[PDB]
């Protein structure tokens, strides 16, 4: 006799354990697996480290203030410089992988807040200018937070990205973003959110450096509140774990 609020996940040499949680969302009903022999196209044999990549990598934390719009991360770009996962994708031409997103935010009973955790495949984002397109290193961030911004970004001759939270940078309603696998963190109940995503693409394998399969978004629908005295610094932490990752086309390093 145990409580469904307690969960443990073991991958590689890493573990996470939760005291309070909701459940696990499993993507589109699909658990990530390897590439079959009737779906593959590349001839040469794939490499599969199986343990040195498929573990938990913990990205930098972000402070949740009373006026934070939200944050976004590119899952392929985020683990580019972390561990052996980054090194394998650097040398190889083709990479295929799945992920899981455990987001942790812990607060006391007195603190009240709401966070939406959703994964968006092909989350193409628009530029502030209508004529030009968003520049790299402006949309992408290495282990970086990349927060949004209430109110429109000024229009001028600059490859700045439109960061409006209500349009989410894609021009769609922020509320309707529940169509993709989503989990809600309610400080009064849920402490963390777990999402498992299978590899989703229109091709069997893709170049990790020039294309991003999915974009993790954390958006506070209801702000953070408390009374004078309680702790003000409330951080959010994100851990990503590649699942059933395989690589092809070994060559000289670089991108």
């Amino acid at each position: 006799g145990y409580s469904d609020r307690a969960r443990s996940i073991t991958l590689g040499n890493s573990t996470i354990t939760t005291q309070e949680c909701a459940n696990v969302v499993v993507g589109y009903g699909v658990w990530p697996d390897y590439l079959k022999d009737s779906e593959a196209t590349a001839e040469d044999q794939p490499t599969q480290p199986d343990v040195a990549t498929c573990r938990f990598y913990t990205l930098d934390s972000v402070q949740w203030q009373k006026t934070s719009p939200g944050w976004w991360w590119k899952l392929p770009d985020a683990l580019s410089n972390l561990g052996l996962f980054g090194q394998n994708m650097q040398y190889h031409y083709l990479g295929r992988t799945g992920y899981t997103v455990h987001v942790q935010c812990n607060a006391s009973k007195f603190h009240q807040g709401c966070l939406l955790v959703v994964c968006v495949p092909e989350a193409e984002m628009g530029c502030a200018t209508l004529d030009n397109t968003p520049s790299s290193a402006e949309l992408l961030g290495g282990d970086s937070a990349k927060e949004f911004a209430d109110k429109p970004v000024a229009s001028g001759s600059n490859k700045l990205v439109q960061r409006v939270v209500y349009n989410a940078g894609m021009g769609v309603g922020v509320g309707n973003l529940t169509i993709f696998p989503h989990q809600w963190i309610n400080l009064r109940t849920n402490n963390s959110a777990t999402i498992v995503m299978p590899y989703t693409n229109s091709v069997p394998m893709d170049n990790m450096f020039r294309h991003n399969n999915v974009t993790l978004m954390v958006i506070p629908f209801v702000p953070l509140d408390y009374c004078p005295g309680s702790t003000t610094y409330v951080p959010i932490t994100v851990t990503i774990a590649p699942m059933c990752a395989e690589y092809n086309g070994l060559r000289l390093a670089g991108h």
């Binding site: 930098d60 934390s61 702790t231 003000t232 610094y233 951080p235 932490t237």
Partner: protein, 59 residues
């Protein structure tokens, strides 16, 4: 602290940051000042070789 009950306690608190270090020590069960005086460490001091796993419980 060694002359007080304070030595056993590990102090944690609320800070305006994250990723700060709480503690750290090497894995030398018989020799490290941290483990030399524990039951297992004292038993090891009567032996030259040791081999196995080590459980660390935090309350």
């Amino acid at each position: 602290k060694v002359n007080s009950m304070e030595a056993y306690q590990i102090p944690v608190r609320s800070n305006e940051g994250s990723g700060t270090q709480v503690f750290g020590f090497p894995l030398q069960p018989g020799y490290s000042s941290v483990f030399s005086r524990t039951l297992l460490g004292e038993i090891l001091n009567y032996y030259t070789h040791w081999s196995g796993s080590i459980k660390l419980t935090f309350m």
